Structure formats: C-alpha cells, structure tokens
Design a protein around this ligand. Structure first.
Ligand SMILES: CCC1=C(C)/C(=C/C2=NC(=C\c3[nH]c(/C=C4\NC(=O)[C@H](C)[C@H]4CC)c(C)c3CCC(=O)O)/C(CCC(=O)O)=C2C)NC1=O
Ligand SMILES: CCC1=C(C)/C(=C/C2=NC(=C\c3[nH]c(/C=C4\NC(=O)[C@H](C)[C@H]4CC)c(C)c3CCC(=O)O)/C(CCC(=O)O)=C2C)NC1=O
Ligand SMILES: CCC1=C(C)/C(=C/C2=NC(=C\c3[nH]c(/C=C4\NC(=O)[C@H](C)[C@H]4CC)c(C)c3CCC(=O)O)/C(CCC(=O)O)=C2C)NC1=O
Ligand SMILES: CCC1=C(C)/C(=C/C2=NC(=C\c3[nH]c(/C=C4\NC(=O)[C@H](C)[C@H]4CC)c(C)c3CCC(=O)O)/C(CCC(=O)O)=C2C)NC1=O
Ligand SMILES: CCC1=C(C)/C(=C/C2=NC(=C\c3[nH]c(/C=C4\NC(=O)[C@H](C)[C@H]4CC)c(C)c3CCC(=O)O)/C(CCC(=O)O)=C2C)NC1=O
Ligand SMILES: CCC1=C(C)/C(=C/C2=NC(=C\c3[nH]c(/C=C4\NC(=O)[C@H](C)[C@H]4CC)c(C)c3CCC(=O)O)/C(CCC(=O)O)=C2C)NC1=O
Ligand SMILES: CCC1=C(C)/C(=C/C2=NC(=C\c3[nH]c(/C=C4\NC(=O)[C@H](C)[C@H]4CC)c(C)c3CCC(=O)O)/C(CCC(=O)O)=C2C)NC1=O
Ligand SMILES: CCC1=C(C)/C(=C/C2=NC(=C\c3[nH]c(/C=C4\NC(=O)[C@H](C)[C@H]4CC)c(C)c3CCC(=O)O)/C(CCC(=O)O)=C2C)NC1=O
Ligand SMILES: CCC1=C(C)/C(=C/C2=NC(=C\c3[nH]c(/C=C4\NC(=O)[C@H](C)[C@H]4CC)c(C)c3CCC(=O)O)/C(CCC(=O)O)=C2C)NC1=O
Ligand SMILES: CCC1=C(C)/C(=C/C2=NC(=C\c3[nH]c(/C=C4\NC(=O)[C@H](C)[C@H]4CC)c(C)c3CCC(=O)O)/C(CCC(=O)O)=C2C)NC1=O
Lengths: 162, 172, 242, 172, 162, 162, 162, 172, 172
C-alpha cells in the first residue's frame, strides 16, 4: 500500500543497501506532516454522515433526471448504493490522510475503477460532482495545512476518475 | 508492503468503518516517538558493518567447526555467503524498525528461509545464533550513540529485539 | 619459539561436509551458474552458436528443439547484427514454438510460472506477482503480457542487452522473498528434467499455488535460551573490563 | 563439474590435507593410460552416427510396437525425439570416458532423465535397451579401430561400460 | 571445477558436439603437462611445513609492527590462524598443480576473497608477501617446467590479491 | 575459426580474464602436436588428385545408374563438379589438420551442407563413399599419429553427412 | 493441429479477444470447402490399396537397382515397410483433406522427417517419386475442386521433401 | 576469430589451393618457437596487475591534469574506468600474442574505440601514452623472468610491441 | 532572419490573422525602449576588443592547460582561432540584441557548433566559460557607459544575458 514509509523501505530493499540519510530525511517529512493530515482525518471522520448525504443529493441536483423512474438515481437500492460508494471514497481519503500517501486510494479505488464503472454503467461525472461538493464544504471544516491535505486527496480522486 | 499505519488501515477496512479513536491515538503516539525511531534506525545503519563483523568474529569464536573443512562457513566463497546473509537480515530488521511493522521482514526475508537453509545443508541453529549476536550489538548501538538527546528508548529497543527474535525463531 | 599447540582446532571437523549442499540438492551445481553466453563485438561464428544453442535451452525449458523446427529468422537477424540478445529473446517468446509449448495448454497460473523461470531465472516471489501478470493479460492480451518480462526493470538491470538469461533463483538476490529458494526447487527438476507437455499434451497444473499461499505461522510466546554454555552474570563484567 | 583429479581433490580437502601418496599415484596411472583414453573417446566420436543408427535399427527390430501407431517412436516427430536421445547418451558416455568420472553424466543427463520419461509415457525399459545396444556397438568400436597401436584396453572398456550401465540402471 | 578437461567438455556440451580431434589435443596438453605439474606438487607437498613457517615469519619481518601487542600478528590465535591460512594457499596451489587448472584456487580461495578479507581486516599485502617469499624459496626446490608451473600458480594468487 | 588457441582465448575473453596456466597448458598440447599433424598435412598435400579421380569413379561404380545417360554422374560437367567437390573436402581436411581444429570444415563445408545438398539433389551417400575410399588409401600413405589425425578429420566429415 | 478453425481461434486467444467477423468469415471458407475436400478424401480412401501398390512399384521402376540383393528395395521387410510408409502418407493426406489444413501432415510426417530419413538412409527421392506417381493417377479419379485439393496436399508433401 | 594458422588458411582458400610449401614452413617455424611464445604470454599474465599499476602510477606522474577536478581520471568512478580500460587492452594484447595474429585485438577492442573516447571526452593522447607505458613494462617482463631457459626472445618482443603499437596508433 | 516584429508576424500569420492588440502593444513597447537598446548594442560594439581580450586573459588565467603544449589554445595558430571564435560569438550576440530575437544567433552561429568543437577536440566546457566571461564584461559595459542618460536597463541586461546563456548552453 503506497505510503511514504513503505516507498522508502521498498527503495532500500531494491537497492539492497541501508536506511541512510536521504531515506531518513524523506521519512521525517511524513512524520512532521502527520499532525495536519490527522486533523483533516478527524474532521472528515466525524462529518462523514453529512458529507455523504450532501454529496449524494448534489449528484441528483446536478443531474436532475437521474431521480426519475427507469433511471439510476431511482428506488431505494440505487440511492442506497450511491451513499455507500461516496462513503467508500471519503473512507479511503481519511485512510490516505492517516497513512501518509495515496496507497489506500490506489489499491482499493483507483486500481480497476474504469473497468468496473464501464461494466456497471456508472458515469464518473457523478462521482466528480460528489467530490467537488465535498471539496466545497470541507472549505469551512478545516483551514491551513489540514485543508491542503484534504484537498490534495479529494483532487487526487477527481484526477483519477478523469 | 505494510507499515504500522497501513496495518491499522487494513484492519479498519475489514470492519468497513473509519478509525476507532482507539487506533487513531495509537498512531498519534507512533508519530510522537518518531524522532527516537529515526535515531534507532540510524544507529543500525551507521554501524552496520561493525554489527555484522562483530557478530561474525563471535559466531566463529564459538563454533570453530564452521571454519574447518567440512564446515558451512568454509572456504572463502561460503564465508562470503554467510557474511552476506548476516547483512541481508540486519537490513530487513532495520526496514521493519523504520516501518513499525515486521511484514517486510517476514515477507521478503523470512518466508521460505528455513527450508532454503535445510536444502543447502546450512546449519540453521548456527544462523539463529548469528542473528542473536547481531541483536546484542545492534541494541548496544541503539542504546549508546553519538550526542543524541538523553531519554528512554526501551520501547524501541524491545520492538527491535522482537524483529531479531522473529528472524531467529523463524530460522532455527 | 615453539607453538602453542593447535591441532585440537583441526579435528574432524565436528560432523563435517565438503561443499555438498549444491550437489546433495542436485543440479544446483550445474545451476549455481556461470554467466550466460554473452555477445561481444565482432563476434565470430563460435560466439553466435553458443548464444544460439544456449538461448534455446534456457528459454524453451530444455525441451528438445529439433532441427526441423529452428526459428530461422530469429537467428538471422541476430547474426547479421541488427538485434540484441534481449530482442532476440523477445522474438523467441512470441514465436509459435514458445506459444504452443507453454501458453496454449497451461492455465494462466501455470503459464505465468514458466515465464518467471524462462525469463528471469527465478520463481514468483509472491502471490501478488501472479495477480499482476494475469490481469495484464486480460486487458492487453498475450503479446503485451510477454513483453512485460523482457521489458522490465528487473530483467533489464540484470541481463543487460547482451547477456543471456540464466538461473539465479538459487542464490540470494537482493529483494527476494524468503520463499524464493524453496519454490525454485519445485520449478527445477534437475538437469535431465525438462519442462514439457508431451506425456499428456495438456501440461501440468500449476505447482506453486499451494506453495505460494502457505501462511506466516506464529510460534508465539517463545522463551529464549541461554543454554548453550554458562554465560556471565554478574556486576564484575564491566569492571574487569575497566 | 568433476573429473577424476577434481574428485581426488574434493576428498582430500574434506580431510584438510594435501593429496595422499596413495591418491597421487592413482592419478599418475590415469596420466599413464591417457593416450589409450583419447583413442577410446575418439572411437566413439568417430562412429557416433553409426552407433546411434545401429542401436536404433536393432531396437525397433526387437520392439516393433514402438513403430506402430500407439507406439512411442511413432510418428516422425517421436522417432526424431528418440533418435536424438540415443545420440546424446552415447555422446555423454564418451565425455565421461575422458573425464574419468561419471558426474557430468549423472548431473546433466541422467539427472532428471528418469522422471521425464514416466511423465511423458515413454517406456523406460525400451530406453534402457537402446542404451544397452549403444554400449555393445560403442565398445565394439573402442576394441577394433583404425591402425591404433596394439595393446590392452579392457580397463577402459569396463569403465565405458559402467557409464552405459549407470545410464541404463538410472532409466529403466 | 576448472581444468582443461572440464573446460573442453563444457564447451562441447554447450555446443553439442562429440569430443573430436580439436578437443583431444587440448586434453593431450593437460596430460603431457602432468609430469612437471606433479613434480612441483610433490616438492611443495613435502616442504609444506617449512614453506609455511618461512612465509608466516616473513609477514612479521616485513611488517614488524604486526607482532606488537594490540595488533593482528600477536598472541597464539592470530599467529596460529595465519600459518593455517598460508597453508590453505599452498594446499590449493598443489591442488591446482595436480588438477591441471586454476579451478581449486578459483572455487575455494578466489571466489569471495575480498569480501572476507575486508570484513575481517586482513590486508592482502601480508598474503602477497607470504607468497612472494614462498616464490623465492621454491626457486631452489624445483627447476625447469615444474618451477614454471609452481610459479604460474603462485603468481595467480598474487594477482587475485591485487 | 576453431583451433586450440582460439578456443582458450574465447574462454578467457568471455570471463574477462587473462590467460592462465590452464589455458597455456592447453596451447602447449596444440604446439607439441604440430609435428605429427604437419607430417600428415605434407603427405596428404603431395599425394592428392588421384584420390579425387578414384573416389569420383567409385561413386559411379557403386551407383552404376549414375554414369548412365539422364543421370547425375554423366557428362563432363557433372563428373567435373564431382572431382571438384571431393577436392574441396580434401582441401579443408588438410586445412583442419594444419589449423589444429575443425574450424575450416565447420565454416566452409558443414555450415549449410544439408540445405545445399537437398536443393541440388546431391546424395550424402556418394560423399560418404568418396570419403570411405579416401580413408582406405590413406591407410598406407601414413601411420601412427599422422594417420590418427587424418582419420579424425575424414570421420568428422562422414558424421557431418549422416 | 493446424486447421482453419484452430488457426483463427489461436489468433483470437493470443490477443485476448472474442472471435469477430474476420475470424468467422475465415471459418466459412473451411466449411464451404469441405465438400470438395471430402470427395477427394473418399476417392483417395477407397483406392488406397492400389494407389499404394502403384507408387511402391514405381519407386522400383524408377530406381531399378533398389530391387537387387544388398539393396534397400530387396526382401520382404524393406518392400513391406515401403508400402506401409506410402500408406502413411496417403493416410495423412486424407486426414489433411478432412481436417481443413496441413496440421495432420505437419504434426505426424513433416515434424522430424529429415532427421529420421537421414538416420535410416531413406532417400527423399523415392518418396517424391511415389507421390508424383500418386499425383498422375489421381488425375482420373477426381476433377474440379476435389482434384485441386488432392493436388494441394500431394504437392505439399513433395515440397516438404525437397 | 583468426590465429596465425587460420590466417594462412583464409589466404590459401582465396586462391582455391592447398597451403603452399612457402606457408607450411612459416607455420612450422611458429610451432618451433611456441614454447617461447607460451613464456611470453605467461610473462604478461603473471604480472598483469603490476603492469597496469606501474603504467598507471607513471601516467599520472606525467599528466596531473587528469588527476585534478576537470580531469578525465577524476573522481574515483573515472579512475576505475581508466584502470579497467588499461586492463582490457593489456588483455587483448596478450590474446593476440598467444594467437600470433592481431585480429582479436583489432576486432574486439580497437574497432570503434577512438570514436567512443572522443564521444566521451576522454583524451585519446593520454590513453595512447598509458598503452606505451604498458608496453615498456610488459616487454620488460617478457625479457627478464623467473628461471626460464636462456635464449633469444627478440622476435616475440617485437611482435608484442606491434600489438601495443597498433592499439596506440588506433587510439591517439 | 527574424527580429522581434517579424516573429510576431509569423505567429499571427499561422493563425490567419491581423496582429492581436495584445501583440501590437508588446511591439509598441519595444519601440518605446529602443533608444536604450541602441545604447546597449553600442556598449558592446564600442568595447568589443576589450570584452574579448579581458574574457581571454581571464580564461587562460583559470585554465592554464589550454596554453601548454597539448592544450587547445596552443600554439599561435590555435590561440588566434580561439580569439576569433570569441569575436564571432560576441558579434552574433550583439546582432540578436539589436534584433530583439535570438534567431540569427541560433541559426548562423550556434547551429552545429557543439558538434564542430567535438569533432575538432576543442573542449566545449572551456568555450562555454569564455562565453560566460564575455557576458560578465559585456553587461558591465551595458550598465556603466559614457554620459548616457540615467535610467533602468535591467530588462535589456537580462535579455543580453539570455543570449550569452543560450550560446553557453548550446556549446557546453
Ligand atoms: C472499495 C471501493 C469500491 C467502490 C468505489 C465500489 C463501486 C461500485 N458501485 C457499484 C454499483 C452501483 N453504484 C451506483 C452509484 C450511484 N447510484 C446513484 O443513485 C448515483 C447516481 C450513484 C452514486 C453517485 C449504483 C446505482 C449501483 C448499482 C449498479 C447495478 O448493479 O446496477 C458496484 C457493483 C457491485 C454492487 O452492485 O455493489 C461497485 C463495485 N465498489 C467498491 O468496492
Ligand atoms: C535525519 C533523520 C532524523 C533523525 C535521526 C532525527 C533525530 C531526532 N532525535 C530527536 C530527539 C531524541 N532522540 C532520542 C533518542 C535516544 N535517546 C537516548 O537516550 C537513546 C540513546 C536514543 C534512543 C534511540 C531522545 C531521547 C530524544 C529526545 C526526546 C524526543 O524528541 O522524543 C529530535 C528532536 C530534537 C532533539 O531533541 O534533539 C530529532 C530531530 N530527526 C530526523 O529528521
Ligand atoms: C539433458 C539432456 C536431455 C535428455 C536426455 C532429454 C530427454 C527428453 N526426451 C524427451 C522426449 C522424448 N524422448 C523420446 C525417446 C524415446 N521414445 C521411445 O519410444 C524410445 C524408447 C526412446 C528412444 C530410445 C520420445 C519419443 C519423446 C517424445 C515424447 C512425446 O512428446 O510424446 C523430452 C521432452 C522434450 C522434447 O520432446 O524435446 C526430454 C526433456 N532432454 C534433454 O535435454
Ligand atoms: C531474501 C534475502 C535473501 C536471504 C536471507 C538469502 C539466503 C540464502 N543464503 C544462501 C547461501 C548461504 N548462506 C550461508 C550462510 C551461513 N553459513 C553458515 O555456516 C552460517 C551458519 C551462515 C552465516 C551466518 C552459506 C555458507 C551459503 C552457501 C551455501 C553453499 O552454497 O554451500 C542462498 C543460496 C544462493 C546463494 O548462495 O547466493 C540463499 C538464497 N538469499 C536471499 O536472497
Ligand atoms: C588427438 C588426441 C590424441 C589421441 C587419440 C592420441 C592417441 C595415442 N594413442 C597412443 C597409444 C596407444 N593407444 C592404444 C589404444 C588401443 N589399443 C588397442 O589395441 C585398442 C584397440 C585401443 C584401445 C583404446 C594402445 C594399446 C597404445 C600403445 C600403448 C600406450 O601408449 O599407452 C599414443 C602413443 C603413441 C603410439 O604408440 O602410437 C598416442 C599419441 N594422442 C593424442 O594426442
Ligand atoms: C579455504 C580457504 C580459506 C582462506 C584463505 C581463509 C581465510 C580466513 N582467515 C580468517 C581469519 C584470520 N586470518 C588471520 C591472518 C593473519 N594473522 C596474522 O598473524 C598474519 C598477519 C596473517 C597471516 C598472514 C587472522 C589474525 C585471522 C583472525 C581474524 C579474526 O577473526 O579477527 C577467516 C575468518 C574465520 C576465522 O576466524 O577463521 C577466514 C575465512 N578461510 C578459508 O576458508
Ligand atoms: C566450399 C565447399 C563447397 C562444397 C562441398 C560445394 C558443393 C556443391 N556441389 C554443387 C553441385 C554439384 N555437385 C555434384 C556432385 C557430383 N556429381 C557426380 O558426378 C557425383 C555423383 C558427385 C561427386 C561425388 C554435381 C553433379 C553438381 C551439379 C549440380 C547441379 O547444378 O545440377 C554445388 C552447386 C553450385 C554448383 O553448381 O557448383 C555446390 C555448392 N560447394 C562448395 O562451395
Ligand atoms: C507416421 C508417419 C511415419 C513415416 C512416414 C515413417 C517412416 C519410417 N520409415 C522407416 C523405415 C524404412 N522405410 C523404408 C522405405 C522404403 N523401402 C523400400 O523398399 C523403398 C525404397 C522405400 C519406400 C518408398 C525401409 C526399407 C525402411 C527400413 C529401414 C531400416 O530399418 O533399415 C522408419 C524406421 C522405423 C522402422 O523401421 O519402421 C520410419 C520412422 N514412420 C512414421 O511413423
Ligand atoms: C604451461 C604452458 C607452457 C609454457 C609456459 C612452456 C614453456 C617452455 N619454455 C621452454 C623453453 C624456452 N623458453 C624460452 C624463453 C625465454 N628465454 C629468454 O631468455 C627470455 C627471457 C624468454 C623469452 C620469452 C627459451 C629461450 C627457451 C629455450 C629454447 C626453446 O625451447 O625454444 C620449454 C622447453 C623446455 C625448456 O627448455 O625448458 C617449455 C616447455 N611450456 C608449456 O607447456
Ligand atoms: C546612433 C544610434 C542611436 C543611439 C545609441 C541613441 C541613444 C539614445 N539614448 C537615449 C536615452 C537613454 N538611454 C538610456 C540608456 C542607459 N541608461 C542607463 O542608466 C544605462 C547605463 C544605459 C542602459 C543601456 C536611458 C536610461 C535613456 C533615457 C530614457 C529613454 O529615452 O528611454 C535617447 C533619447 C535622448 C536622451 O534622453 O538622451 C537617444 C537618442 N539614439 C540613436 O539614434
């Protein structure tokens, strides 16, 4: 799972050398950065419930037609599986925030994304719009380096979907 | 590959939920002790050669059969292989120590290792001992270094020991 | 000035062995292996034959390649000098005889094991490693899948553009998992042993699936031992030293 | 790879010793008989094709089932696999005759040879027989060649036989 | 193990051709040469004891300081392990003489030499000087092609250590 | 071109290595054996042509239908190209004798032999029978190690054609 | 075993791809062609006995000397193994006709042909002449596309032997 | 690859001829002097390291420019490359000397070498000089060795020189 | 050949358009600063000889190897060639400075220049340095001249620098 520590350890192993300064210096960054990351994580964690309901709705408000009959934003099961999916994204964002890298996002959401979405007729546009909305609201839950961190990972998902 | 955070994340995900304020603060503490951790990994890196050398001198002091003909650290080729393995294991122990998790050690180094040595005729009990000696000296260095701020590193010295002890147990 | 006697030190030696491990294991001696039949500049006829005879054995898994089936054009380019050993390989791997012999009748798992053997001289270190390859087959098809071994950092770093691939599974390579060594023994059958399907035609079920997934294992608790011999205890140790 | 000298050396080393006057003269004798050895290896090389061909003709004379459909030397592809086989073994036997040691034969050929054949459905008893026929003819040639100086080659003919007999035993 | 015999066989095998007359002379060279080789071997074998004590001492006479306290030519164990090591070299020289090639030297002393010497703080200079001395004395134990053979292998070790 | 000298040099080069006592011993074999080789060479050189006319005829006497009209042993051009071809073989045999290896035979007659013979409807049997005859007569032009050498190379050609 | 069907499937599989209109068009060729192929097959099948005896004899009539004593067309066993061999060829020709490709010929007669014939002193010329004769007589058993098919495969064997 | 015999053979073949009695005896003489040749090749092999080392010491004694930053034998990486090239060239010169023909030297070492160095910015005149120094010392050794039978080796010393001089000329 | 206006025109034409009001005013500004530009070009012309001379003195002060035998600015012929090249490059830099575009410099001086020097054995790093020294002194003169009206020439000093830096980069 791609993270600062993991990456440097892997580098060392490949080189078959020793945890030198370059590596130690790089690792310090990840440690020094944990405070901002983990503040973002705690805020995203406790607001999860509403961040998810906010983004779910925004998908329907931006794509009104989705909520009409015969469509994929209709009936309990579609709307249920949607909330769940955005919740998966926020969950992995918090994980990436805590982990010190994109690993959790890369391994659990990015690897395979397009194939899955294409087989199931899920448009990335919805998911981008869910995330754009989550990004709007996270503007007032955080600030400074915790916000920058939250943003880094939200944007990473938007770019991944694109 | 896992580190101590990644491990937390995998267990959380298997519940399908977010961090349990329990796990969050365990990880906040790892960040709290991370300067000490960096010094501990640095202690090993900065003395790797001597740690291997000193372990070695002492291994063959004890087991003079290995350096006789018929012995598994004879002739030069075999001694170089044995010295190389001492380095490889010390390496993956230092990686585990930076990571706060044994997995890199178990997955790349320890997995299959015993069965390799048995196939080769390499006496595993001697290899286990060489690992025990590396542990003694490595921890020596973790505990008594160049102008590091004075404090308590026993938690980290224990954890380093368990990585040395994992390797020993896995091999013997 | 007379010698402190030292003949006690050369006794037996204890249970002693004599560079046995490779031979006892069997076949390891052949394959604790001298580097490949590299290609130099201005290579003469002797050099081309070594590379060509060698390559086939090494990449076709020691199956008898008969006179009637040589790939006539792989070698032509290699002699006229247009292509490297590395692209000579990439042209044998996508040939019918390679395709026919291993991919066509092996499952994916089985098929993936052999590329690690024929192409990098080692067993797959991990379960994930098979996942990646299989998946790449699903999206990119067969040709792309073969390309990945040859065109990869590990293959390139070690076999350059001029060395021919050789067994390296039996020696510790930086970064390999512990299980590389025993796993490689299943893959290798000894010097007579050949990786071929003629007996059934189908070819065997993948050997490493069960070996690949054997678990960690927790001899936990564990209390160490000081015996051994009697070990010093006391406070005097530092002081005597001082 | 070993030859007869290398074998001596490995056994000496396992004692931690310079070669015994015993072993020295055993090797002096091998040098003494080496011209004969070269003629013996040359006898096989110079008639390799006929040795394989004649063994072959006779194998299928005896075992007419192999060349019927259902048989392991049918169709052309399988016969070519079989006929090449005979030649390899004859060629391997003559390497051993000069090395003065069976190891190259056991390690590179016989090593793994039995196993293959059963997996393939190749009748090992027939392969053993083809090896027995190669032996008869090969030794024939070692004993009755073109203008070689007259003398006694029975020691070498025996040794060649044991290499043929090793292969047969290993395979059947 | 590299000998003339193993080399030609290796080259045939890798090439699949019967040992033929080009090869047979290579082998004839090795057999014709055995007499000189084995005379060198017998002389080096019976003088081993003194050749070793002569070279051991010469290491201390050329590096006087080695024999002072705190140094690596001091105490029974260092001086014992030294004699042993030179004895290993002479042993493999005799083996290489008898075998018809450098194989025994390549496999048992050269492969790994520098790594070992570097970990154990053993200077090649000592070993070169041990061998230079052994070469001086072997000048009067042998002559003609036995001396040339002895020299060939002693020099081979000295180049391995430079 | 395969000779004892080129072989040992090839083996050194491919291990990035100076020639050592193993390789020089080998070379001495080739040089020690030059006298016998070169005596065979001189005898085969001066007693030459008739061997070709003898073998050519024997191909027709053993395959009578050969010298009949419509056949490949008929007319000046076939019979001329035959003498030439056996002469090529004897020529390369002398070269292989002088060179100390099969190189000249491998490079100029063996490489490509079957493809050529198959396209041109030339049966190896003729050529084997030409060579078997040459081998019969060379029994009384030479003896001892010159005969063994001549034989080695004649037999090498016969195996190349079977 | 090479047939139109196996070839297109092989080509699909190797690109990880379902059979498409390109591959199904190909298959239709093989199926459309079956009638002519199978008519050739039935005619070659029932005339087998005489086609074989005709070709066997023609080998002796074209190479008269084969039937003299000491030769390979003499005695019951040679002449028996000959009939058998031509029968093998006709058998695989019918198989190739029925199969829709050269596979049966490639796998059971072509792979290994020359090595076998060379070890056993079997001249391709005989076999070509057996097949040339079979081709002459099949001129009046078939016509149109069945004859073209029979010819295709007979000629394929003759090229395999040249 | 050619040796002195192989060269003769190629020229003969281009005439369509068996070797001339002229060429035969030229080659008989090569065999005549072959023990001396073996000693000459052995002189170089037995002192390879010192020949390179001594050439080196002297090259940098003369040309401090390369030793200073900006210089082509600075830092350690470049010096190791330069020492390596000295060995490579000495190696192919010894091969040519065993062979009695320059071709292995010209084909495997000298062909393209100048253009390589110019591409790299390696001063060819300095490389030529390093080759001249190797020549001086190598020949020194060919002429004054350990208990070789006394005789005249000047023909061989010349021939060795031309191989050193070929390399120098080709590179400068 | 291009100047800054011509460049604008070529880009406009590739759109099929009359010049943008954007581009128009960028060019109006070039006309605005043109008296300063003329002084800047005049600064170089008026001190060309000293700029080359002073660069030169300093180049050989630093790199005393160039003026030794073996060096690329030895003997007189080579020094004159080197002095000539310094002038040629300073000349095309002044042309670019009058033009407001690097093209004349790139097209008639820099194009192929590096490969010329490498073919010749001329050390490109030394040539790059000579260009860096010309830059220092040339700009010196652009900034501190005879009774020019006081104002800010830094924009032009930058632009001149990039022409010197283009040349350096292109050559090294
Ligand atoms: C671990 C990370 C992970 C992700 C991200 C994930 C996505 C994902 N979404 C799915 C389905 C779905 N996804 C949605 C999504 C939506 N419906 C709406 O009302 C909105 C338009 C939208 C939310 C924005 C719908 C409706 C389905 C049901 C599709 C179907 O089966 O027809 C499925 C198919 C399996 C299933 O039916 O549950 C996957 C795998 N799965 C994962 O394991
Ligand atoms: C280049 C990578 C890198 C390293 C190595 C690093 C080390 C580092 N170690 C530190 C503290 C320290 N390090 C130690 C370590 C020890 N105390 C002992 O008595 C033991 C002998 C040893 C046990 C390992 C202690 C006790 C402190 C002070 C307490 C703390 O900051 O946690 C600090 C805080 C500043 C200070 O108090 O000096 C840093 C920055 N920082 C980095 O960015
Ligand atoms: C290390 C040297 C070495 C040996 C010894 C070797 C043996 C060997 N023999 C094989 C096949 C074979 N071997 C034979 C041999 C025979 N058939 C008979 O009926 C006879 C009893 C016998 C001949 C005397 C046949 C027919 C096959 C093909 C089996 C098949 O594909 O159905 C194969 C499978 C690969 C292939 O067909 O090329 C191997 C590896 N391979 C090697 O690399
Ligand atoms: C994944 C990281 C990794 C490890 C850990 C590893 C172990 C390893 N140790 C090996 C050999 C060896 N290991 C030793 C070690 C010892 N001999 C002794 O007597 C001592 C008890 C001990 C030293 C403390 C020796 C002597 C050999 C050579 C055995 C032989 O060839 O006979 C080999 C066989 C390949 C080779 O020789 O290079 C492997 C794969 N390889 C790896 O890639
Ligand atoms: C090119 C490689 C090479 C070969 C092949 C070689 C052969 C060779 N065989 C020899 C002798 C001989 N070779 C034989 C061999 C035999 N005697 C018999 O009756 C058997 C049929 C046959 C059994 C193998 C005998 C009996 C001698 C004479 C005794 C001896 O010299 O040992 C001799 C000594 C000279 C002589 O007496 O003719 C040489 C040089 N020398 C070489 O350099
Ligand atoms: C099979 C071939 C082979 C060789 C060549 C060999 C060399 C060798 N020398 C060693 C040690 C040693 N070698 C010496 C050598 C010397 N001390 C002196 O008084 C002199 C300066 C010098 C002799 C010239 C010393 C003092 C040690 C002990 C090093 C230590 O453990 O601190 C060791 C370490 C294991 C041990 O302590 O025995 C090896 C492997 N081992 C082999 O298996
Ligand atoms: C350098 C080594 C070398 C060899 C060995 C060689 C063989 C050779 N023999 C050939 C033809 C031939 N070879 C023969 C041979 C014979 N005719 C008879 O009367 C006898 C049956 C038999 C002699 C035993 C015949 C008749 C031809 C003419 C074939 C044709 O063009 O139809 C040809 C075709 C080119 C040509 O027509 O000359 C080659 C290449 N060429 C070479 O360059
Ligand atoms: C599946 C396809 C297949 C083919 C084509 C085949 C050919 C073939 N022909 C053979 C022998 C033979 N082939 C012939 C052929 C002939 N004799 C004559 O009278 C004529 C000149 C000629 C017929 C035109 C002869 C005489 C032998 C016996 C050779 C021997 O053992 O000496 C043999 C050797 C095994 C044996 O003795 O049966 C094979 C494998 N085998 C196969 O499995
Ligand atoms: C292991 C490979 C191998 C070598 C190295 C070898 C050397 C060798 N050198 C020899 C002679 C000799 N070698 C030399 C060489 C020299 N004379 C000088 O004064 C120069 C310093 C030096 C110039 C190179 C001379 C002059 C002779 C005596 C004349 C001769 O035999 O040609 C002889 C003949 C016996 C003798 O007279 O000692 C042998 C066997 N033989 C071999 O099989
Ligand atoms: C014969 C060709 C020709 C030249 C050379 C020329 C120069 C020239 N430079 C001028 C101004 C100037 N020239 C400069 C130049 C500088 N100021 C500094 O402090 C720097 C040291 C230097 C930088 C290059 C400045 C600042 C002005 C006044 C502002 C301006 O007019 O743009 C003027 C306007 C009148 C004046 O203010 O003096 C002219 C006509 N005219 C021409 O027709």
């Amino acid at each position: 799972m791609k993270t600062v520590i993991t990456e440097v350890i892997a580098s060392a192993d490949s080189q078959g050398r020793f945890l030198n300064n370059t590596e130690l210096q790089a690792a310090n960054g990840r440690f020094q950065r944990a405070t901002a990351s983990m503040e973002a994580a705690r805020a995203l964690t406790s607001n999860a419930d509403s961040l998810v309901k906010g983004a779910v709705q925004e998908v329907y408000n931006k794509f009104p037609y989705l909520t009409q009959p015969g469509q994929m934003g209709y009936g309990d099961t579609n709307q249920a599986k949607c909330a769940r999916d955005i919740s998966h994204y926020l969950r992995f964002i918090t994980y990436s925030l805590v982990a010190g890298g994109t690993g959790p996002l890369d391994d659990y959401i990015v690897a395979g994304l397009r194939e899955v979405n294409r087989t199931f007729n899920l448009s990335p546009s919805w998911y981008i719009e869910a995330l754009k909305h989550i990004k709007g609201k996270v503007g007032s839950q955080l600030s400074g380096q915790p916000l920058t961190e939250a943003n880094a990972y939200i944007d990473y998902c938007i770019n991944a979907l694109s | 590959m896992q580190d101590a955070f990644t491990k937390a994340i995998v267990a959380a995900d298997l519940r399908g939920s977010f961090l349990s304020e329990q796990e969050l603060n365990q990880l906040t503490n790892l960040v709290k002790e991370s300067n000490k951790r960096l010094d501990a990994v640095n202690a090993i890196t900065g003395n790797a050669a001597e740690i291997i050398s000193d372990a070695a001198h002492k291994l063959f002091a004890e087991q003079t059969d290995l350096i006789r003909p018929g012995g598994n650290a004879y002739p030069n080729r075999r001694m170089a292989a044995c010295l190389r393995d001492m380095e490889i294991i010390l390496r993956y122990v230092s990686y585990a120590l930076l990571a706060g998790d044994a997995s890199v050690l178990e997955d790349r180094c320890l997995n299959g290792l015993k069965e390799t040595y048995v196939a080769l005729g390499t006496p595993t009990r001697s290899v286990a001992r060489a690992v025990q000696l590396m542990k003694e000296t490595a921890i020596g260095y973790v505990n008594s270094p160049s102008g590091v701020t004075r404090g308590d590193c026993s938690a980290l010295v224990n954890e380093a020991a368990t990585y040395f002890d994992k390797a020993a147990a896995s091999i013997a | 000035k007379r010698v402190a006697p030292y003949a006690q030190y050369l006794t037996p030696a204890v249970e002693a062995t004599p560079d046995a491990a490779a031979q006892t294991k069997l076949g390891i001696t052949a394959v604790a292996p001298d580097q490949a039949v590299e290609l130099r500049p201005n290579f003469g006829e002797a050099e081309v034959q070594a590379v060509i005879r060698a390559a086939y054995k090494q990449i076709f898994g020691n199956t008898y390649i008969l006179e009637a089936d040589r790939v006539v054009i792989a070698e032509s380019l290699l002699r006229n000098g247009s292509i490297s050993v590395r692209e000579f390989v990439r042209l044998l791997a996508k040939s019918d005889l390679y395709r026919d012999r291993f991919f066509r009748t092996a499952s994916n798992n089985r098929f993936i094991e052999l590329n690690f053997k024929h192409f990098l001289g080692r067993a797959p270190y991990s379960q994930a490693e098979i996942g990646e390859h299989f998946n790449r087959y699903h999206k990119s098809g067969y040709d792309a899948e073969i390309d990945s071994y040859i065109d990869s950092d590990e293959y390139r770093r070690v076999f350059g553009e001029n060395t021919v691939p050789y067994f390296r599974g039996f020696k510790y390579q930086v970064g390999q998992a512990a299980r590389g060594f025993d796993q490689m023994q299943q893959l290798f059958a000894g010097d007579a042993g050949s990786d071929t399907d003629r007996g059934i035609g189908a070819q065997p079920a993948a050997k490493l699936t069960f070996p690949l997934s054997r678990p960690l294992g927790v001899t936990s608790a564990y209390f160490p031992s000081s015996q051994g011999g009697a070990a010093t205890s006391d406070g005097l140790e530092m002081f005597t030293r001082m």
